[PDB]
Design an enzyme around this catalytic site. Structure first.
Site, PDB file in Angstrom:
ATOM      1  N   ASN A 185      20.668 -33.906  68.022  1.00  9.34           N
ATOM      2  CA  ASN A 185      20.522 -34.538  69.345  1.00  9.34           C
ATOM      3  C   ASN A 185      21.468 -35.715  69.553  1.00  9.34           C
ATOM      4  O   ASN A 185      21.793 -36.477  68.610  1.00  9.34           O
ATOM      5  CB  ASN A 185      19.057 -34.965  69.568  1.00  9.34           C
ATOM      6  CG  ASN A 185      18.770 -36.340  69.022  1.00  9.34           C
ATOM      7  OD1 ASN A 185      18.958 -37.347  69.720  1.00  9.34           O
ATOM      8  ND2 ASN A 185      18.326 -36.401  67.760  1.00  9.34           N
ATOM      9  N   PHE A 218      19.162 -42.661  74.029  1.00 10.15           N
ATOM     10  CA  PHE A 218      18.100 -43.571  74.531  1.00 10.15           C
ATOM     11  C   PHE A 218      17.835 -43.387  76.036  1.00 10.15           C
ATOM     12  O   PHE A 218      17.834 -44.361  76.811  1.00 10.15           O
ATOM     13  CB  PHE A 218      18.431 -45.067  74.271  1.00 10.15           C
ATOM     14  CG  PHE A 218      18.283 -45.543  72.843  1.00 10.15           C
ATOM     15  CD1 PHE A 218      17.436 -44.925  71.915  1.00 10.15           C
ATOM     16  CD2 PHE A 218      18.975 -46.701  72.444  1.00 10.15           C
ATOM     17  CE1 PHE A 218      17.334 -45.419  70.606  1.00 10.15           C
ATOM     18  CE2 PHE A 218      18.842 -47.221  71.154  1.00 10.15           C
ATOM     19  CZ  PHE A 218      18.030 -46.557  70.226  1.00 10.15           C
ATOM     20  N   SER A 242      19.797 -45.500  65.499  1.00 12.13           N
ATOM     21  CA  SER A 242      20.217 -44.376  66.326  1.00 12.13           C
ATOM     22  C   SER A 242      21.718 -44.155  66.131  1.00 12.13           C
ATOM     23  O   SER A 242      22.495 -45.099  66.233  1.00 12.13           O
ATOM     24  CB  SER A 242      19.982 -44.635  67.806  1.00 12.13           C
ATOM     25  OG  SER A 242      20.537 -43.542  68.528  1.00 12.13           O
ATOM     26  N   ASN A 295      23.438 -42.630  68.255  1.00 19.41           N
ATOM     27  CA  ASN A 295      23.872 -42.228  69.609  1.00 19.41           C
ATOM     28  C   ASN A 295      24.101 -43.365  70.593  1.00 19.41           C
ATOM     29  O   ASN A 295      24.275 -43.127  71.788  1.00 19.41           O
ATOM     30  CB  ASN A 295      22.890 -41.188  70.177  1.00 19.41           C
ATOM     31  CG  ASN A 295      22.774 -39.986  69.268  1.00 19.41           C
ATOM     32  OD1 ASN A 295      23.786 -39.528  68.737  1.00 19.41           O
ATOM     33  ND2 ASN A 295      21.560 -39.491  69.053  1.00 19.41           N
ATOM     34  N   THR A 296      24.105 -44.589  70.082  1.00 19.37           N
ATOM     35  CA  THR A 296      24.419 -45.773  70.879  1.00 19.37           C
ATOM     36  C   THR A 296      25.519 -46.529  70.131  1.00 19.37           C
ATOM     37  O   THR A 296      25.319 -46.921  68.981  1.00 19.37           O
ATOM     38  CB  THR A 296      23.162 -46.642  71.093  1.00 19.37           C
ATOM     39  OG1 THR A 296      22.243 -45.930  71.934  1.00 19.37           O
ATOM     40  CG2 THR A 296      23.516 -47.988  71.759  1.00 19.37           C
ATOM     41  N   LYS A 349      13.585 -49.509  61.301  1.00 12.30           N
ATOM     42  CA  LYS A 349      13.934 -48.114  61.035  1.00 12.30           C
ATOM     43  C   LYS A 349      15.416 -47.999  60.714  1.00 12.30           C
ATOM     44  O   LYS A 349      16.279 -48.432  61.490  1.00 12.30           O
ATOM     45  CB  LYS A 349      13.614 -47.234  62.247  1.00 12.30           C
ATOM     46  CG  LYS A 349      13.805 -45.745  61.953  1.00 12.30           C
ATOM     47  CD  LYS A 349      13.127 -44.927  63.055  1.00 12.30           C
ATOM     48  CE  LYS A 349      13.324 -43.427  62.810  1.00 12.30           C
ATOM     49  NZ  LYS A 349      12.627 -42.670  63.907  1.00 12.30           N
ATOM     50  N   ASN A 399      16.004 -42.416  60.071  1.00 12.99           N
ATOM     51  CA  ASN A 399      16.465 -41.777  61.301  1.00 12.99           C
ATOM     52  C   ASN A 399      17.275 -40.493  60.971  1.00 12.99           C
ATOM     53  O   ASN A 399      17.338 -40.040  59.798  1.00 12.99           O
ATOM     54  CB  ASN A 399      17.325 -42.783  62.091  1.00 12.99           C
ATOM     55  CG  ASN A 399      17.145 -42.639  63.600  1.00 12.99           C
ATOM     56  OD1 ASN A 399      17.228 -41.527  64.149  1.00 12.99           O
ATOM     57  ND2 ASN A 399      16.859 -43.757  64.271  1.00 12.99           N
TER      58      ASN A 399
HETATM   59  C1  FMN Z   1      15.342 -34.899  69.891  1.00 13.77           C
HETATM   60  C2  FMN Z   1      15.136 -36.134  69.023  1.00 13.77           C
HETATM   61  C3  FMN Z   1      15.007 -37.387  69.629  1.00 13.77           C
HETATM   62  C4  FMN Z   1      14.805 -38.528  68.839  1.00 13.77           C
HETATM   63  N1  FMN Z   1      14.672 -39.765  69.404  1.00 13.77           N
HETATM   64  C5  FMN Z   1      14.435 -40.876  68.645  1.00 13.77           C
HETATM   65  C6  FMN Z   1      14.237 -42.215  69.219  1.00 13.77           C
HETATM   66  O1  FMN Z   1      14.264 -42.362  70.470  1.00 13.77           O
HETATM   67  N2  FMN Z   1      14.030 -43.244  68.377  1.00 13.77           N
HETATM   68  C7  FMN Z   1      13.974 -43.100  67.022  1.00 13.77           C
HETATM   69  O2  FMN Z   1      13.773 -44.096  66.303  1.00 13.77           O
HETATM   70  N3  FMN Z   1      14.141 -41.902  66.414  1.00 13.77           N
HETATM   71  C8  FMN Z   1      14.354 -40.792  67.156  1.00 13.77           C
HETATM   72  N4  FMN Z   1      14.500 -39.534  66.560  1.00 13.77           N
HETATM   73  C9  FMN Z   1      14.441 -39.443  65.105  1.00 13.77           C
HETATM   74  C10 FMN Z   1      13.064 -39.031  64.588  1.00 13.77           C
HETATM   75  O3  FMN Z   1      12.142 -40.084  64.879  1.00 13.77           O
HETATM   76  C11 FMN Z   1      13.133 -38.854  63.074  1.00 13.77           C
HETATM   77  O4  FMN Z   1      13.557 -40.107  62.478  1.00 13.77           O
HETATM   78  C12 FMN Z   1      14.147 -37.765  62.651  1.00 13.77           C
HETATM   79  O5  FMN Z   1      14.268 -36.702  63.608  1.00 13.77           O
HETATM   80  C13 FMN Z   1      13.769 -37.189  61.273  1.00 13.77           C
HETATM   81  O6  FMN Z   1      12.505 -36.513  61.319  1.00 13.77           O
HETATM   82  P1  FMN Z   1      12.354 -34.912  61.499  1.00 13.77           P
HETATM   83  O7  FMN Z   1      13.342 -34.294  60.523  1.00 13.77           O
HETATM   84  O8  FMN Z   1      10.902 -34.665  61.153  1.00 13.77           O
HETATM   85  O9  FMN Z   1      12.671 -34.648  62.957  1.00 13.77           O
HETATM   86  C14 FMN Z   1      14.712 -38.380  67.360  1.00 13.77           C
HETATM   87  C15 FMN Z   1      14.834 -37.122  66.769  1.00 13.77           C
HETATM   88  C16 FMN Z   1      15.040 -36.004  67.550  1.00 13.77           C
HETATM   89  C17 FMN Z   1      15.162 -34.674  66.846  1.00 13.77           C
HETATM   90  O1  ORO Z   2      17.967 -41.285  71.873  1.00 16.01           O
HETATM   91  C1  ORO Z   2      18.579 -40.793  70.914  1.00 16.01           C
HETATM   92  O2  ORO Z   2      19.693 -40.221  71.044  1.00 16.01           O
HETATM   93  C2  ORO Z   2      18.139 -40.953  69.501  1.00 16.01           C
HETATM   94  C3  ORO Z   2      17.668 -42.183  69.047  1.00 16.01           C
HETATM   95  C4  ORO Z   2      17.379 -42.282  67.672  1.00 16.01           C
HETATM   96  O3  ORO Z   2      16.946 -43.351  67.192  1.00 16.01           O
HETATM   97  N1  ORO Z   2      17.591 -41.219  66.871  1.00 16.01           N
HETATM   98  C5  ORO Z   2      18.065 -40.045  67.347  1.00 16.01           C
HETATM   99  O4  ORO Z   2      18.252 -39.061  66.570  1.00 16.01           O
HETATM  100  N2  ORO Z   2      18.351 -39.911  68.655  1.00 16.01           N
END
Ligand code: FMN
Ligand code: ORO
Ligand code: CHW
EC number: 1.3.5.2
Length: 366
Positions: free
Chosen positions: A115, A119, A185, A187-188, A225, A254
């Site tokens: 992804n 944000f 993140s 992505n920022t 995080k 993350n």
């Molecule tokens: C589509 C998507 C959006 C995410 N958005 C955020 C976010 O806004 N803030 C954040 O701290 N982590 C975000 N994450 C990271 C997840 O919180 C997690 O740290 C990461 O995906 C690893 O866990 P998983 O393998 O179980 O998905 C996002 C992950 C995915 C896949």
């Molecule tokens: O908003 C996102 O792009 C995002 C935030 C984040 O903390 N981690 C991530 O995988 N995506």
């Protein structure tokens, strides 16, 4: 295993994924969850799964990771799904759109997602009002072992990162059991640089001062995080700052900007953070490192590629007090939550642990 687990994993989820683009699928999932249109959560949590950490009781140690419910729309539906705790966000101070679509990609052959949302956020004011509408309901949930975390981000165009996080502490801190300073993140632009020693110390000092200024009943734990892509130096520095400032915990990790050898998905070279199975062991090893660097004295929420009881227990034994998942839910659907909990309980018994608490950091004591 149950029939629901099999039906969702083998038939329903792959069929629906074949019909809906990833972001539409995500939006539908949030909508269905928010309305409580979910399979019956059969699994009753046993006493073995209870964890006391971060000034709270957690009925079970399996949480929904940030990014699923970015805007706090589906919190109650997530508890109904069987999560022991819910984290919403990331939330930015002002509303912002995030990146242009498409910005999420499935890698089915890898059980992974990439992804680059960037944000997308309804902003602090919208989320504040959303949480205020259920604040007392949440107070009762928290008391009954079901805490709420709020994950804070920063706006794309802000000229003062620390002030963005400070605003998040002031606005959402009073509604959260814990806050997450998301400096990881991918992505920022420039965000991950806030993990550097000097930047992190300055940022966290400000965040902690703001938190400490909240009334006692409204004073959340503060966690940071971190990325899975840090150098050994970066990790040493973070551990040092955490200990110096008395940061309450870490969320590890993350998504990764790495692309492990062996990815098969056609979309493997899309820009963004990679999640799911290819991240799993990189995350586990980062938990292991951070636990050792903090002498086991700093609670860790372990996250990255958890899809089974074994995945959960590996992170717990590496030093996690709690775990989260997201990507597994995207592939296997709601029955994965009960699956992880049932498998985790069985494994704890098999490995001679009295409960989750006994297993935390057990690998370090071998
Ligand atoms: C589509 C998507 C959006 C995410 N958005 C955020 C976010 O806004 N803030 C954040 O701290 N982590 C975000 N994450 C990271 C997840 O919180 C997690 O740290 C990461 O995906 C690893 O866990 P998983 O393998 O179980 O998905 C996002 C992950 C995915 C896949
Ligand atoms: O908003 C996102 O792009 C995002 C935030 C984040 O903390 N981690 C991530 O995988 N995506
Ligand atoms: C009641 C439910 C119905 C889901 C229908 C569906 C098609 C989900 C897949 C899916 C994806 O394919 C992707 Cl790609 C994402 C990102 C997400 C993010 O959440 C995601 O949920 C859910 C299980 O709670």
């Amino acid at each position: 295993a149950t029939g629901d687990e099999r039906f969702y994993a083998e038939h329903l989820m792959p069929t629906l994924q074949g019909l809906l683009d990833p972001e539409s699928a995500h939006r539908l999932a949030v909508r269905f969850t928010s309305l409580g249109l979910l399979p019956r959560a059969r699994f009753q949590d046993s006493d073995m799964l209870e964890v006391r950490v971060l000034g709270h009781k957690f009925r079970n140690p399996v949480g929904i990771a940030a990014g699923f419910d970015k805007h706090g729309e589906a919190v109650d539906g997530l508890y109904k799904m069987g999560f022991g705790f819910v984290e919403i966000g990331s939330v930015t101070p002002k509303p912002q759109e995030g990146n242009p679509r498409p910005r999420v990609f499935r890698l089915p052959e890898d059980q992974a997602v990439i992804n680059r949302y960037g944000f997308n956020s309804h902003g602090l004011s919208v989320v504040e009002h959303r949480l205020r509408a259920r604040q007392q309901k949440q107070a009762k949930l928290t008391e009954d072992g079901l805490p709420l975390g709020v994950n804070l981000g920063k706006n794309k165009t802000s000229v003062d990162a620390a002030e963005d996080y400070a605003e998040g502490v002031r606005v959402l801190g009073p509604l959260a059991d814990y806050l997450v300073v998301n400096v990881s993140s991918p992505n920022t632009a420039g965000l991950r640089s806030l993990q550097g020693k000097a930047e992190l110390r300055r940022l966290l000092t400000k965040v902690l001062q703001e938190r400490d200024g909240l009334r006692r009943v409204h004073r959340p734990a503060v966690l940071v995080k971190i990325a899975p892509d840090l150098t050994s130096q970066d990790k040493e520095d973070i551990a040092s700052v955490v200990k110096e400032l008395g940061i309450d915990g870490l969320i590890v990790t993350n998504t990764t900007v790495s692309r492990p050898a062996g990815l098969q998905g056609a979309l493997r070279s899309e820009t963004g953070g990679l999640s799911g199975k290819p991240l799993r062991d990189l995350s586990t090893q980062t938990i292991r490192e951070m636990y050792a660097l903090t002498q086991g004295r700093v609670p860790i929420i372990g996250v990255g590629g958890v899809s089974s009881g074994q995945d959960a227990l590996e992170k717990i034994r590496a030093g996690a007090s709690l775990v989260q998942l997201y990507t597994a839910l995207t592939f296997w659907g709601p029955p994965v939550v009960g699956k992880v909990k049932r498998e985790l309980e069985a494994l704890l018994k098999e490995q001679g642990f009295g409960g989750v608490t006994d297993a935390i950091g057990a690998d370090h004591r071998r």
